[PDB]
Design a protein around this nucleic acid. Structure first.
Lengths: 71, 189, 322, 146
RNA sequence: GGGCCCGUAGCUCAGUCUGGAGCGCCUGGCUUUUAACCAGGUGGUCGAGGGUUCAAAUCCCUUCGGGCCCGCCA
């Protein structure tokens, strides 16, 4: 049970990352752990509830980092 | 080769040989062709003892990698299964007999079954002996891929009647069917 | 002329490329993930490499120039496919250009056809974890023969790991086999169209453990495995009645395999081809070309339809570029 | 230009002295020889294959019996009292062998009838279905396999 | 017909001198899952009979099958 908040300079990039990552989020047939992936203004919030939790948080840190760096 | 148009003792026979495939190493080619001829003769002979109709064996030659075998009028299972759908059932029986008696035929295709009067298993080249259901399951998988690649349009009925025959002859069929899913699992995720 | 940017993250070889429809590749780059001790991943390498490769892509060509983005949505490792998909979606939206998720294997075939002679090929695609023979039958690309446990590349890699040769063990095992003199007795399984390289690999491991000379063991392993591959290629050639075969994939680097296939095709009166080393291995250029070809004929793709497909099949592509 | 002379003789007294007399002959238990083919096949296999026995005219018996072993082949298919099959090459030696062995010429004993087929199957362990002559030729052809 | 050798777990071999482990698959982790990697499980009481031995698969005999050799040829 944890929350990860990420803030970005602009709502434009916030939506960028959110809708480039949400399709991946919903593309997983069976999830590592219970997840929530939501857009709050110019920020993205992830909620985790599970080992599997550590993998999930690392994987999502990586997805978001890649999405950020693509710019 | 396989084309001779000869009659041993007035018996119509075609001597089949394995032309030396030069692309591979000489010694490995020798070993493979020798073992293939040995196993083909072995099992084209042995299967008959299971009541599984096949061509005859009349002379082996490991020195020349040749086997002489009674010819059967040209009617291939691959070329008739779409026309006659009962030969798939018949293949079911004459391959479930193999599986029940612990013999593996690792080239299962509708090209390896002639049908003039009954179902002749006219090749057994890659045969083997196994008491493990996994080898039988993989052989069934090979036949499944062959039937798909040839006549997938009728795969439904072909496999349905193949399983009908397999049920009719083989008794522990469900065990190997369940084991098949383990091999079907190779496709990664 | 429309141009596209493709990524490639199905395996350890993070590829990025930009290719045009004129018949040339503007840019291509690949970073092969060096394996650690047997925990980073191909996906980690993709995440920390695709930004850099894309920076070089920007440097060599302006962002607004590229008209389409493609990406290898499958088949391949899950996390790596997902990293390439994430980057593909992000770049698609950022540049306001459409996204396409294309198939790795068919991509290999189309790059082979583009770079090599022009044909409709029987492609023996062999790589680290994707061995199979593919071709165009029933107006689609469909598998014919494949391994059931392990691919040829993974077989060689695991042999190298057992003999402790440093990764990659490809050239090392090739040279040791070249040195070898006698071919140890190893299993030779060709289950119709398929292969089971697990038996060969395990038997070679046991034979080496028994004390048989390393060069002889490597020669045995190589000759047996690549003979099985050549035989399934013969069977597929007979099955499809095609007119030419193509070696494709990373293991295409093995001169012995190449010569074996060449001698085969010479004996059977058929033509053997193979893409240059720049295109054999996984790279972004091939995915770029496949996406460009898909969108050329007018095959759009909703951004929601670009999911990863780990268990992608070469027939699930509605091949419509003929 | 003379194919091996093959004749079935019935009601012939068997004398062990013939073997040590010294001559080129073969005597086969007529109850198991399926037909003329069952011995033409053995002739061809002895002529072509790598010999298993020191003698051509004893390899004939070994092949006709199928079993590689010589003791079993002799004790089983070797000619016994009464009906027998004579494999020979020349008329004068054939005449002498006929005079010594005795019996009457009737090839019908070579042919197969219900009892003969039952005995052939029982003694060759021929399970499964197939033409008798072809299948026994097969069982005799499978010698060249470990 | 005879002599020598072989037979142990689902697979492969030590253990026969003189009285089990590996592989396979399963389970948890390893970045859920694997490509690989690490840990626990699953596994015979040893071809069969007889005798010896407190104590044998382990020493002797017979047989069951398998491999090597000896052949004595009607």
């Amino acid at each position: 049970q944890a929350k990860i908040e990420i803030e970005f300079p602009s709502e434009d990039v916030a939506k960028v990352v959110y809708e480039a990552v949400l399709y991946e989020h919903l593309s997983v047939p069976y999830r590592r752990s219970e997840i929530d992936f939501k857009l709050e203004g110019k920020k993205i919030i992830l909620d985790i509830k599970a080992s599997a939790l550590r993998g999930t948080v690392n994987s999502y840190l990586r997805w978001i980092k890649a999405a950020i760096d693509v710019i | 080769a396989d084309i001779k148009r000869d009659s041993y003792l007035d018996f119509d026979v075609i001597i089949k040989e394995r032309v030396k495939k030069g692309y591979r190493d000489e010694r490995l080619d020798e070993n493979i062709r020798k073992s293939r001829t040995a196993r083909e003769a072995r099992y084209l002979a042995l299967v008959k003892d299971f009541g599984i109709p096949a061509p005859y064996i009349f002379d082996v030659d490991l020195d020349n990698k040749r086997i002489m075998m009674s010819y059967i009028n040209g009617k291939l299972a691959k070329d008739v299964i779409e026309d006659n759908l009962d030969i798939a059932y018949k293949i079911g029986e004459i391959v479930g007999k193999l599986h029940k008696n612990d013999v593996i035929h690792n080239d299962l295709t509708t090209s390896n079954f002639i049908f003039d009067k009954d179902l002749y298993i006219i090749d057994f080249g890659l045969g083997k002996i196994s008491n493990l259901d996994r080898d039988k399951a993989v052989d069934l998988i090979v036949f499944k891929k062959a039937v798909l690649s040839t006549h997938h349009e009728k795969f439904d009925e072909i496999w349905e009647r193949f399983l009908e025959g397999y049920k009719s002859v083989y008794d522990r069929w469900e065990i190997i069917l369940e084991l098949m899913k383990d091999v079907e699992r190779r496709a990664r995720y | 002329p429309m141009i596209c940017l493709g990524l490639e993250g199905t395996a350890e070889k993070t590829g990025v490329g930009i290719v045009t429809s004129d018949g040339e590749v503007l840019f291509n780059k690949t970073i092969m993930y060096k394996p650690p001790k047997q925990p980073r991943e191909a996906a980690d390498h993709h995440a920390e490499t695709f930004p850099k490769l894309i920076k070089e892509a920007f440097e060599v060509v302006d962002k607004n120039e590229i008209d389409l983005i493609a990406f290898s949505q499958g088949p391949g490792l899950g996390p790596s496919l997902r990293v390439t998909a994430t980057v593909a979606r992000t770049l698609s939206l950022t540049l306001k250009k459409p996204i396409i998720g294309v198939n790795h294997c068919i991509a290999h075939i189309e790059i082979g056809k583009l770079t090599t002679e022009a044909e409709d090929p029987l492609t023996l695609y062999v790589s680290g974890g994707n061995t199979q023979v593919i071709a165009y039958v029933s107006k689609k690309y469909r598998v014919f023969g494949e391994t059931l446990d392990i691919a040829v590349g993974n077989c060689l890699d695991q042999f190298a790991r057992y003999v402790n040769l440093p990764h990659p063990g490809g050239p090392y095992i090739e040279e040791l086999a070249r040195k070898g003199k006698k071919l140890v007795d190893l299993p030779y399984t060709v289950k119709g169209m398929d292969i089971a390289f697990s038996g060969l690999l395990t038997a070679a491991m046991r034979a080496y453990d028994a004390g048989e000379r390393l060069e002889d063991i490597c020669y045995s392993l190589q000759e047996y495995a690549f003979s099985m591959l050549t035989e399934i290629t013969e069977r597929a050639l007979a099955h499809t009645n095609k007119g030419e075969v193509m070696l494709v994939g990373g293991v295409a680097a093995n001169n012995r395999l190449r010569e074996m296939l060449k001698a085969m095709c010479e004996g059977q009166n058929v033509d053997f081809y193979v893409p240059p080393k720049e295109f054999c291995g996984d790279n972004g250029a091939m995915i770029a070309w496949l996406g460009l070809l898909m969108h050329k004929n007018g095959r759009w793709m909703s951004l929601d339809e670009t999911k990863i497909i780990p268990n992608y099949r070469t027939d699930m592509v509605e091949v419509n570029w003929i | 230009m003379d194919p091996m002379i093959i004749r079935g003789i019935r009601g012939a007294r068997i004398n062990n002295e013939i073997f040590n007399l010294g001559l080129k002959f073969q005597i086969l238990n007529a109850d198991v020889v399926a037909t003329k083919k069952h011995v033409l096949h053995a002739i061809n296999q002895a002529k072509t294959k790598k010999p298993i026995a020191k003698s051509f005219w004893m390899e004939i018996l070994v092949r006709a019996s199928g079993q590689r072993q010589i003791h079993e082949a002799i004790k089983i298919i070797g000619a016994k009292d009464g009906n027998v099959c004579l494999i020979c090459e020349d008329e004068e030696t054939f005449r002498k062998i006929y005079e010594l062995i005795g019996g009457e010429i009737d090839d019908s004993v070579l042919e197969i009838n219900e009892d003969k087929e039952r005995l052939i199957r029982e003694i060759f362990k021929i399970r499964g279905f197939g033409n008798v002559v072809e299948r026994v030729l097969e069982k005799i052809a499978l010698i060249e396999l470990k």
